[PDB]
Amino acid sequence: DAEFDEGFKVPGFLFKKLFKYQQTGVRWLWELHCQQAGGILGDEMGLGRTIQIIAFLAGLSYSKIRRFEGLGPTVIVCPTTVMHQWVKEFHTWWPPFRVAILHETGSYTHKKEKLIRDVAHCHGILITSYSYIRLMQDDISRYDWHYVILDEGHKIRNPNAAVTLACKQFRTPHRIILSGSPMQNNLRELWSLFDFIFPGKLGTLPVFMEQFSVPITMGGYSNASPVQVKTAYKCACVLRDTINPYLLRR
Amino acid sequence: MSYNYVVTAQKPTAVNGCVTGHFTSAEDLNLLIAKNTRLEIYVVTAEGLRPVKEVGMYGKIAVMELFRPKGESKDLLFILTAKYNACILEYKQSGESIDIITRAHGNVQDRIGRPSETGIIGIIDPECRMIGLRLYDGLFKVIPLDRDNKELKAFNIRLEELHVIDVKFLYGCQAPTICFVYQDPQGRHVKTYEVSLREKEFNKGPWKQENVEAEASMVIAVPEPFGGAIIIGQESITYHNGDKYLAIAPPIIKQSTIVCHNRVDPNGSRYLLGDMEGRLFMLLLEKEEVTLKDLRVELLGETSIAECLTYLDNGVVFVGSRLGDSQLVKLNVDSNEQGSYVVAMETFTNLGPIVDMCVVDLERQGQGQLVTCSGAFKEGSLRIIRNGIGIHEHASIDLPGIKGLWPLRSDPNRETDDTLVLSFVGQTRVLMLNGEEVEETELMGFVDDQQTFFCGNVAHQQLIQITSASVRLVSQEPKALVSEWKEPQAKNISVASCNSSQVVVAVGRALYYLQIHPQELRQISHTEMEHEVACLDITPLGDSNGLSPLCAIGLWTDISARILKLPSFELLHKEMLGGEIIPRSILMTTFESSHYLLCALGDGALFYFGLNIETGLLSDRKKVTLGTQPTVLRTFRSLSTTNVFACSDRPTVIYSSNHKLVFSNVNLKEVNYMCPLNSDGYPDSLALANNSTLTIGTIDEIQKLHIRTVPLYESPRKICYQEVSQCFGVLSSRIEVQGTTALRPSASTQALSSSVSSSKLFSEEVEVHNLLIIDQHTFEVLHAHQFLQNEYALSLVSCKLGKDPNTYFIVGTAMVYPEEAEPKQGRIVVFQYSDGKLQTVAEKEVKGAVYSMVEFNGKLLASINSTVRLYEWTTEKELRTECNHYNNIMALYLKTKGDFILVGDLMRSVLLLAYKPMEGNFEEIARDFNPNWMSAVEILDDDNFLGAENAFNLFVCQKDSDEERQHLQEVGLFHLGEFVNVFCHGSLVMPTQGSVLFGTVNGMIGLVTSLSESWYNLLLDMQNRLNKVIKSVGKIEHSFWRSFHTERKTEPATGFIDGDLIESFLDISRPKMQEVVANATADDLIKVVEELTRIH
Amino acid sequence: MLGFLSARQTGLEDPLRLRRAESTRRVLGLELNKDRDVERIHGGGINTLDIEPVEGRYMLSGGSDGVIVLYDLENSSRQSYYTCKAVCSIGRDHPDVHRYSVETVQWYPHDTGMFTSSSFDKTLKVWDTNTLQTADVFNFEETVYSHHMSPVSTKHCLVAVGTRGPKVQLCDLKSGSCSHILQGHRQEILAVSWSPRYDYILATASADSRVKLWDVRRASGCLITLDQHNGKKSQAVESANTAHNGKVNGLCFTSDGLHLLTVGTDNRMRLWNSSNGENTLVNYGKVCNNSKKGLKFTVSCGCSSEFVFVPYGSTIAVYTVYSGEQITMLKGHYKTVDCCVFQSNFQELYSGSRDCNILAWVPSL
DNA sequence: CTAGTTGATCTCATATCAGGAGAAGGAGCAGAGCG
After folding, report:
1. Which end of chain C is more exposed for a tag (fewer CB within 10 A), N or C?
2. Could you give the CA distance from residue C351 to residue C313 in angstroms, rounded to a whole number?
3. What are the angstrom distances between the C-alpha of C140 and each of C116, C179, C181, C211?
4. Beta strands in B222-314 (DSSP E)
């Protein structure tokens, strides 16, 4: 087995299948769990962000870390295309977990709320889509989720979209975003992602814009004075330093 | 930077903790004794204790408990150090090799925390599921064992009670259940908690909190049949098992508090209880069929004041004392007709709390000799410690004026010399010495009419006797003389010499060579020297053929220990010496390496040489002075090698250790002559004559520190030596109860004469203080002056003041009343000891406690409560103030060197004061602004000030190089682990500069001395190497152990070399040395470390 | 006492006894030393004092006039009487002086080379002690009522800042990131204090009568809200769980960090278990404060018994922490007392006050 | 029953001079108590 600080043992066979960077990832995710903070797995796509989550959750359940005796009920929000992909992935890389799909396709064939309750009681891994999160913020946000992974989490990049608010209604600190590109147009998107994972780190949205987005943007324009270039440089470095612990971008 | 070398002259002797168990083997019963830093392992034999291993911890052993985890064959040892190094030790013996492997270790010091008042508690679950440590207020550290650690990861449980007195794990509980007494404003209560290693928090205990006696200070977990706990308070002993509440108030335990206990049985039907008075009680649990019926306390007797006591077996109890000698007592079934069942079997020397000490060159030698105020209330005593060979005086016979001693095997078969010969003036008197019996019976062939310069056993199964007239070679078995030679002119032999094979005898200014042949004496060589012979030696050494090759000669008027080639009497070398004194003895011997010559003059000077077997040329001339009387040198062969003895006013054994010539002292008054003897009744013994009698004995030759004990039976406080009067003045203190009554006959109450202070100045149990004048030969209390009622004698100096010639005992006192926290009143009393009486020559009412007085350039420098003032001795013989100094919290310690005064404060730590005589006032020169609470202080150099803080640290301050020049710089830091009570210049012996001894509370005597920069660098390098090589018991780092440590500061050591660690460089095998000495050769460093060990 | 010296000398008692007991005895004897003075440099009241945690030699002092004075507390003169001379001073002419009242000032723990000071000009300025130039300036949108750097964090170097805003700002001095906010209070935060035991626990007290302890590492809001009654009056937490019945304008963890003392304008002090915020019900009686801003009070360290020294109007009231007994009230100021700081080496207390004086209280004899 | 298709139907994302009269406030200031 592989052992980390307090009680985290991930099975050795599982660990050996991983790469070195994926192992680093698993360690990073567990350090966050210790802090009770969230993070963004900003690995460039194709590196296999999902494999790292599988390993980490597997290790956490296996270690039976101490409300919850190891891994509680958890929800995975991922784009509609990849739900069965994630189901497949859990099934191969760790059969023991129950991975219920929440979708019209699904596998339940009853009312959905019964399925939500079932997973929240039997401590499964409820996969769902951003739509069903937007549409059942009421039902879903009544069950003490342990982990709230968002795959391709950039879809929460609009702080005012409904889906964003719904995703930010979840209460647990163990929020994770798996987003190959956690910033696509401007930093407002970044702030939004951080406000899901770590609600206070970057401040309020107005303050973030005032302090970071404006200066960092103005330093990119061709006509910007060198002074403003250097303010942008400063602010950019501050931002990287602020977000360093909580973003793992290989 | 300062370069200081600290070493242990006497390891700590105070037993701070002892446990029993099966540590070295499942069948052995071990007694593990923690003396402050030493762990001593014994085996509990049917008689006494057999030492097996003594290890040095890098820590003060705060906790020491044996526990046996499931499946383990034999007990593992848990030790917690004062710096909170935890370790679990196992004993692994592999044949001759013995190891203490560290099964686990760690550091459990919380970064922050109020260290608990009552002190570090360490308990172990009776089922070894956890080690509970109470280190800080409000927290309870748990070290799991079921989770088998190697790093001892421990977690705190928050304890809702912040003042915990004592705590124990209860027996017969499915969960680890602690029972502790804690103090809240509403009184003292006993509470229980269950420890959950899974939930890592407490739970409700089996039986709820109970309001107990006000002074409950002890919890005793009682084994499974009864369960429950027994809480000992001052006036009651109560038993709790949850519903049962037995309670007794035995009137006999009201007089003193019970401080230690031990479970005699495995089932807890009997406990020992030791009190601070030294009584020993037996607490009996009467079972009823099982529950507990009733409690009984019975007084077994008295012991030393026990810190810890352990019951070994068969009534043998080890009483481990911090205040007095530790004891091995027996508990008799029947009383001793004095009401006591305790009978002391053995006593282990304990230099107890060394509260003061002085170095006196008593016996007028060149050797210092510590006299220490050791021990406490009932165990107080003076210890005299010295370094010298010790021998037993078995066979004595008082024949005046011996002038000869030789071992003779009168039984020809045996190679033991069962006959002793002595020449007195003009005859020979022999001794049969048969067995241990001694009587004078005559062996044929030797004359009772002539002096004998020599006799002894020689080859061809022959004896030889050289007389003042002529030589006599006796055939041993058959009959008397068949060979005689005499001088042709019949001149008396003036100087002789002889060995087993040949003979060399001087006749005035000419010399004669004879050699022995069986039943014949053949003369060969002759010479005519310039002047008369003074001394000879012809001893064959490394002979390997049968005859010595060389000889040495000392001559008159040409003072020179010259060398001769034996077959020719010719001059091989002629080396002058100087002086008008004829050499009186000359010898050559081997010390492990080659032939040396030892020639001495009449005044104890003695020259050792490297003699060659081919040239026999004298070089490597170096001198040593030993005694004042003319000398004589005769060898005895030990187990190991030749060990030469010198006979004079100061008898000294001569020998070489690690190829280094040592000059040990022997602790006997005088020895005229010596001779080896190895009789059937006497093996390898000595035969030492004085002017009166023939003393006989044997020498251990271990060069151990010898410790005399003078029982005072009361707490000594100070001691000073008044040489002019031949006495020691000792401040003593005895406890009286009622007006008052002495609880026991103390040394003060048993003096020859006595007196009480009648002073016109000032007009349960109390402390009475006396000034004891003690004879410096017999150590009898010549006089005991009691001080005023409620007067505490604190300081005491012997000195002569001003210009008058009388040497005075000056005592500074304080008036102690319970109505106040700091004395407002006190006085400086001047005594003179003369004509066996102690007259009060002067007095001076001061307005505070006189904590310290040093005689300072003809003047008395006293330190009243916060003021340092200087007194002058006026022609009228009274003390008159000259100057004051007030910038002190409490001037507790005063030292002096020239015009400078070092003041150790209660908590401002040092102040360098100067008495500028031109003005007549003090000047604050420098000050150390760190808050160190001093325990003692010393002045090493003009600008180096040794200090000891009450946190067991040594620091050296240094006057730096503006107003930052008034800042002493702490250039030396070192954690001693001992509480220094006293420093004093001096040395216990005849590279390093200066020598400061110190005495500690645990009984350590250490030695600080100044090094040069080069040697300090070298020794620091080797210190790091040894740390890289030597492995400590609990895997503690030496640098961490010696790091300066305080509750509000922690810095690494610097400017101090652990002389213990360096001197450990000898006790490692050669490959390990090479590991040490990678980057000069090893033998260089062996020489270095030997020379370093030479200082103590 | 000579009993104490004799006990130390003979090993009857651990030397820890004599320190701690004597330390206590010294604390009980605190008396206004007229044999010690502090040089007057503030034109306005002293809001804050801070003795440096290592070596305790220097004190910083922040005034209502905006100046920061740096005093040397060692008696370098040979007399028994001395004035703690002022080494440096951020005076009216310094280019970087605060514009309005300095409200807090703090030595960087771990090193005397840098201190920090925050003001009503809405800035927290970090200063190089040696050159006495600002190394950094954090600007806040609201006036700063207090800040505090962790006495224990070898790892993080966050400054917690309480302003009139309802949010707690954490300012990272390592790359300067003043974005992180703890949100959950509702009115100005009048006092913040890091735990002396735990690296990342912060307690913050606010005018909404609530005190919250935070694990700033944690992304999930307060750990604990202190509740006066421990549950006797229990409500779904929207307005209940008030620590006090007024504003809570003071916090101080006890030395070992196991309890928290809060003072608020209901004229009470409470002692709270800092692990579960439970109320220990220590009484302490009536402690007058009506300060509208933070009240800076301390605890003793290294005594047999812990004491808390609280400004009580124009006096410093000394209380025993764990029993509540009022030891004494030290009476020597003329106007209200704003701050008292404890010198742990020698059991000396310095207290500033609105009358522009800093009085030293040193044990008598 | 089950995929497949097909509308709706939602969400989210993309970008730079010949007026006059009267009423209300404020400012300046004399002066009167008055503490």
Report:
1. C
2. 12
3. 15, 10, 12, 22
4. 229-232, 237-240, 245-248, 258-263, 270-275, 279-288, 291-302, 308-313
Phi–psi pair at A187, nearest 5 degrees = -75, -20
Element (DSSP H or E) covering residue A230: helix A226-243
Alpha carbons B274 and B321: distance in angstroms, whole number: 10
For the CA atoms of A44, A50, A52, A53, the dihedral, rounded to the nearest 10 degrees, stands at: 130
Please name which of C92, C70, C74 lies closest in space to residue C82, comparing C-alpha atoms.
C74
CA neighbor of B57 nearest in space, from B16, B117, B94 = B16
> Which residues 46-85 of C have a C-beta within 8 angstroms of B?
55, 57, 74-80
DSSP state, B808?
Answer: E
Task: Identify each DSSP E strand in B370-519 by its residue range.
Answer: 370-374, 381-387, 406-408, 419-423, 428-431, 452-458, 462-467, 470-475, 481-486, 502-507, 510-517
The SS3 of residue B454 is: strand
Kindly state the helix (H) or strand (E) to which residue B552 belongs, with its residue range: strand B550-555
d(CA C277, CA B200): 19
Q: A243: helix, coil or strand?
A: helix
What gap in Å lies between CA B616 and CA B561, rounded to an integer? 12
Structural resolution in Å: 3.0
What pairing do the DSSP bridges indicate for beta strands B791-799 and B808-815?
A: antiparallel
Block residue for tokens 């050499």: B583
CA distances from B543 to B83, B498, B536, C362 (A): 60, 15, 18, 82
Looking only at the bridges linking them, the beta strands covering B808-815 and B781-786 are: unpaired
Q: Chain A contact for C199, CB < 8 A?
A: no
Enumerate the H helices of C283-346 as residue ranges.
Answer: none
Q: Which of C80, C199, C254, C258 to mutate to test the interface with B (most CBs of B within 10 A)?
A: C258
Alpha-carbon Rg for chain B, nearest whole angstrom, is 34
Can you tell me which residue has the tokens 């930010």? A168
Q: Which residues contact C112 (CB under 8 A, 6 or more apart)?
A: C52, C54, C55, C58, C129
For residues C350 and C339, what is the distance between their CA atoms, to the nearest angstrom?
8
If you measure CA to CA, which chain C residue comes closest to A244? C175
Question: Which residues 165-184 of chain A have a CB under 7 Å from nucleic chain D?
Answer: 184
Pairing of strands B452-458, B428-431: unpaired
Q: Return the residue matching tokens 């990678």.
A: B1078
> Is the shortest CB-to-strand distance from A188 to strand D under 7 Å?
no
Answer positive or negative: Cα dihedral of B450, B454, B458, B461. Answer: positive
Cα B1022 to the center of its chain, rounded Å: 27
Rounded CA gap, A216 and A46, in Å?
29
Greatest Cα pair distance in chain A: 63
Alpha carbon distance B988, B206 (integer Å): 60
Q: Do B574 and B562 contact (CB within 8 A), yes or no? A: yes
The answer to whether C270 touches C279, Cβ cutoff 8 Å, is yes
* Breakpoints of chain B, after residues (C–N > 2.5 Å): 289, 738, 763, 961, 990, 1079
Residue B502 structure tokens: 């040949």
Amino acid in the structure at residue C330: L
Ramachandran class of B658: left when φ > 0, alpha when ψ lies in -120 to 50, beta otherwise: left
Task: List the determination method.
Answer: cryo-EM
d(CA B957, CA B934): 13
